[PDB]
Design a protein around this ligand. Sequence first.
Ligand code: HEC
Ligand code: HEM
Ligand code: HEM
Ligand SMILES: Cc1cccc(-n2nnn(C)c2=O)c1COc1ccn(-c2ccc(Cl)cc2)n1
Ligand SMILES: Cc1cccc(-n2nnn(C)c2=O)c1COc1ccn(-c2ccc(Cl)cc2)n1
Ligand SMILES: Cc1cccc(-n2nnn(C)c2=O)c1COc1ccn(-c2ccc(Cl)cc2)n1
Ligand code: FES
Lengths: 48, 241, 71, 64, 51, 147, 49, 62, 378, 54
Amino acid sequence: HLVGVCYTEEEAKALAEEVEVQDGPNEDGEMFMRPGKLSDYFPKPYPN
Amino acid sequence: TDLELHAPSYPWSHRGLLSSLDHTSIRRGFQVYKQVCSSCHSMDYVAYRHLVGVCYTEEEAKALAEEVEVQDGPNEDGEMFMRPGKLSDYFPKPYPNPEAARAANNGALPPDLSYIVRARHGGEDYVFSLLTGYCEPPTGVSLREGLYFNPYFPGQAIAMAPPIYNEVLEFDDGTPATMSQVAKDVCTFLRWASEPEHDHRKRMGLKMLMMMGLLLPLVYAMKRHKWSVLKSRKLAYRPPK
Amino acid sequence: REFGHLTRMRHVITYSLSPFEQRAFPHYFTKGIPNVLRRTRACILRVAPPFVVFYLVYTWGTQEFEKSKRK
Amino acid sequence: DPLTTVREQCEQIEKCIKARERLELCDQRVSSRSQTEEDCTEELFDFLHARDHCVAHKLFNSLK
Amino acid sequence: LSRFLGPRYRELARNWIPTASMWGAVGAVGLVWATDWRLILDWVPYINGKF
Amino acid sequence: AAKNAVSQFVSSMSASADVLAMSKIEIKLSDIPEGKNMAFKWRGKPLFVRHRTKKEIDQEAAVEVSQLRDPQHDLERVKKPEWVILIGVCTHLGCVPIANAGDFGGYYCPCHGSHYDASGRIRKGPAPLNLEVPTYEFTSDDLVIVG
Amino acid sequence: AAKNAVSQFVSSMSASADVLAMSKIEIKLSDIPEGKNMAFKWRGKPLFV
Amino acid sequence: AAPTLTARLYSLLFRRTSTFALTIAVGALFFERAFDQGADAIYEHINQGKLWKHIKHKYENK
Amino acid sequence: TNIRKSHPLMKIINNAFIDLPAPSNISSWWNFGSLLGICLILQILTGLFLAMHYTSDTTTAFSSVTHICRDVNYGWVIRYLHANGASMFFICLFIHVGRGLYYGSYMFLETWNIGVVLLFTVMATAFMGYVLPWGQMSFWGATVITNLLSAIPYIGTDLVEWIWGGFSVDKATLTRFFAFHFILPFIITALAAVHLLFLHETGSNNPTGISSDMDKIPFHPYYTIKDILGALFMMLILLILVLFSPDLLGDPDNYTPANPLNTPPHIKPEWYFLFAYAILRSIPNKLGGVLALVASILILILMPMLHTSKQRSMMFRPLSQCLFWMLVADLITLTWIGGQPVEHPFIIIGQLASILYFLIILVLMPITSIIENNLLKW
Amino acid sequence: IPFHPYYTIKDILGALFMMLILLILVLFSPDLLGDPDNYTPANPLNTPPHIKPE
Ligand code: HEC
Ligand code: HEM
Ligand code: HEM
Ligand SMILES: Cc1cccc(-n2nnn(C)c2=O)c1COc1ccn(-c2ccc(Cl)cc2)n1
Ligand SMILES: Cc1cccc(-n2nnn(C)c2=O)c1COc1ccn(-c2ccc(Cl)cc2)n1
Ligand SMILES: Cc1cccc(-n2nnn(C)c2=O)c1COc1ccn(-c2ccc(Cl)cc2)n1
Ligand code: FES
């Protein structure tokens, strides 16, 4: 929601990559980490 | 080139117009699902709380969910908690989150079995003729290394190894578990699976057939009362001569 | 179009009886089946032979599809 | 084994004596030459359809 | 039939036709602003259609 | 009452989207091992992205145009021949098969014994056309923009 | 026969199967170590401990 | 004379143009456990020993 | 001071249903017009319950339908009422059209023309609702239709892009099939009240075609009780199918969820679209199929202009009704062919009977009405 | 007097004056009439300072 408001799309794809999030399950393993993919709501400060 | 084989019609105990499903045959049919399949197949539309009043008592089916422990969601003090199963438990998946179960199954995904009887031309009549009509490939017919010659499959080459033989398990009531007894039980469990309202609708279709034997003769006699004025009348034409 | 405005009629008389002076079923099966057998002999020579032409195409149309898959 | 006692005598009908009698009359003909694509699936379908009906009328009373 | 043709209806069709055309070209150019016909907004380039 | 009542209210359910960055600007990962291709999420059906890795070459130009129903070859649509993406539609029905089944290296359509190829042409009938086109402009280094 | 459309109508919108199996009773004993109290974010109306 | 010589219930019941529409409301009773006969008697007669309340006594008492 | 004749609301009811002059010899075929109004109110009430639990999303839609059949109270009886209460709508609709064609009722021109509009809006509403369960017949029936809708040369390719939501098949794809399916039954209702405002100008036709202003009876009590008897006989046969065989008319392949990665063995619509599907596949072109589709429903408007007989009804016309049942026995042949594979015998029969449907209405009917005039000495 | 043209044109003038004042509130102050406390999600574990209808 910031592209066109505060930053260009680069400066925002690269700003999502500052933090790595937990995405869903998978084969060939589990709980795999992933950086921001721009479809990412702002990270939670607490688990619960 | 080859053709289609059609399953013969069996005299089931629920193929009558006011008939039911034999509930002890559904009890023995869940065990054959528990222990022969459910390692290659699933059932994500049927829970454990749906068999209370059908096969098992609520005490009997509470202790039957306990056998498997299912991962639940995140919390404090941990990330993925482990707890035993409750009655709010859909039957757990055999290859969970399976990108390619074919890795375990030679390039073929085994289907969900929640609607396998409602989604086949021949119903549970097709599933019984599938499991008890296996053969070995005939002359001129080739084969892949993980394919078997089933005559009741459309391509006649199925990637499922024959899952039932004589005494794959033993029942908790002493019936002799031969190949046909275990098959009939999972075609009476797999009809209740895809059609759980089967018995409730054949009795509700009796509480209206005895109400149209009352109501329908009694509006027809209101009709013949009014129309008898017109049905009996006489007409005459008397012009001046 | 109300009742005393529909047409013009002269010299016709009508006699009618009460619903309470009549039995419910005067002639039910002594007159019922010779009346239905009259209406069946009339309109079955117009209705039925179109539908036996569908039948001879259906029985021939699944005797060619089953020899289309064999020898 | 309620199958294989029902299955056995159900191929002693004089309708299954016709449907399998030509199965090895065509079974001996495919592997004669090394390059032919004639399968034997069809005279197996005539035999299985003629056998599985007679099994269906006689099997469900022996069980449960 | 013979109810329909003559020297009357087709000279009533003579001053009809301009009416027909401007009943037809009304339907032609009027359809294109309601249903977003992008293949005919190109032909007159003066009208900025979508921003 | 026309240019502001009717000319406005198509864009909620039109080619104007719901999410800003969906697949058109989303750059794609190597979540695809070469050998088989499995399903996706948007653009409707699985737009099967391809890493031939020096494969599919020659297979393309071995059979020529004569009995081939549709003149549409991968010499011009895709720019360099280690690159294609597919469509999940058909020309008559809407058919794609379970991936990597066939004799030549193509598709096993079990509806009417039809047979399709990997990069989208047809041996059989009754397919009138060949499988249609996705919209793309490949520009940058590794970032995949289809849309 | 005239109730058969409408006597099945009032008992229709009281909820069916996902509700009275668990909102009947939820056993939640042996939860807490002593000295501090928790909150149960269930029971419809809330319930404490 | 010889025909039914009983009472006449058209000088009270049904005759009312109102009752034509009131026997959705005033004529809406009397016949629910008179038809818990038949319905719950011939359903549980053809279904002998197959329902759950015909077999639950085995797994009732331990 | 009769309150049935002077009250502002009650006058309209009294003029339309109570004191209306009706012919005395009206038979059972005039009952199916009130059965269509029974079937329409039933589909609207049952459809509003099913809309409270449905979710339009191509990932979560096959699962929303199984949720009502296995979790929601009475959801199995309300869902199978709806799927079977649309087969009853379509069997009453084809008897109703064949009545008005037989007894010459199309001569009420303003009534007949609104009827042909009602036959389009009904056939389009039952299409948008069958795609909504989102199984293997709901996907491969919508992509057969939209291929024949992107063959219109000037509007066709940008129109199918709007109904799919701008994409192929995603969440905002079934949002437009669901919105038009909610709305069009409330337009069928308003077109049926205008339908009966034009019949009130002449009153009804009667099996003899001859006018009947000497022999009228009031509508109440004679046809208010005869219609009620026919409406209860309809609810008997309807509830037989909901409670004894609710899967008799549908298809099993719509119980497999929608997935383009697999393919069904056949493409088969419901029984009441099979005559219109045997005509699309009979013309080997995507333009001569979408034109031969709409010509099969639009040909009803030429029926007032093609009538060349001196009499109105077919009761006294024995050669004209011999051709009425060749037309009924040809819509049966087009319903059997419409659910067969496209093979050798099922295409020579599919096109020799898509021709005969148009040769009977347009050519063979107006010539046989003239031979009848010539044998009666006009 | 007849209703058309005298009150078919006088009502149209009043209906366009209504859509002016309505679209002023949608596009210049769309939260003037509501309440902020309905932007806190429903939770009985907390309590609002006041109860206020529209
Ligand atoms: C160890 C493997 C394995 C076991 C055990 C197994 N299955 Fe399957 N099943 C498969 C595979 C693989 C397929 C898919 C076959 C194919 O698609 O070629 C399959 C598919 C099916 C089908 C669909 C067939 C069709 O025509 O679509 C039915 C029905 C079925 N299984 C029933 C059963 C029953 C009943 C049991 C046990 C009582 C069972 N399966 C146990 C592997 C298994
Ligand atoms: C939603 C659909 C429809 C509804 C609710 C409806 C309703 C009715 C009703 C209530 C009547 C009066 C009773 C009767 O005569 O049966 C009637 C008559 C009639 N309808 Fe329909 N109808 C519908 C569709 C159609 C169609 C599709 C046609 C023809 C193409 C049609 C043509 C006629 C005609 C011609 C009559 C008068 C017949 C006569 O009096 O002889 N209607 N309709
Ligand atoms: C007027 C005539 C109508 C017809 C002929 C019709 C037809 C259909 C059909 C054939 C289906 C497919 C059912 C299935 O295959 O399971 C369906 C589904 C559905 N319809 Fe209707 N419908 C009508 C009216 C309505 C109305 C008025 C509404 C909403 C208010 C509605 C809402 C729905 C919904 C929500 C579904 C969801 C899918 C399902 O439950 O199967 N329908 N309709
Ligand atoms: C309005 C109108 C106008 C012109 C003709 C006719 N009509 N239709 N058939 N006949 C012989 C006619 O005179 C009608 C009546 O329309 C119908 C059809 C059924 N009902 C009905 C039945 C029972 C009850 Cl309770 C209420 C209504 N009304
Ligand atoms: C091809 C195919 C396959 C499977 C299901 C279905 N289908 N879709 N809906 N229903 C109930 C189905 O059976 C179909 C569509 O079949 C047809 C044929 C002609 N129409 C049609 C005619 C007029 C209008 Cl206006 C709209 C559509 N639809
Ligand atoms: C108490 C409280 C607090 C917050 C919001 C709301 N409320 N609920 N809806 N809206 C718009 C609100 O402002 C209320 C309800 O306030 C009232 C007062 C009387 N009625 C009433 C009168 C007639 C009828 Cl028939 C129905 C209701 N409602
Ligand atoms: S892919 Fe379906 S027949 Fe060609």
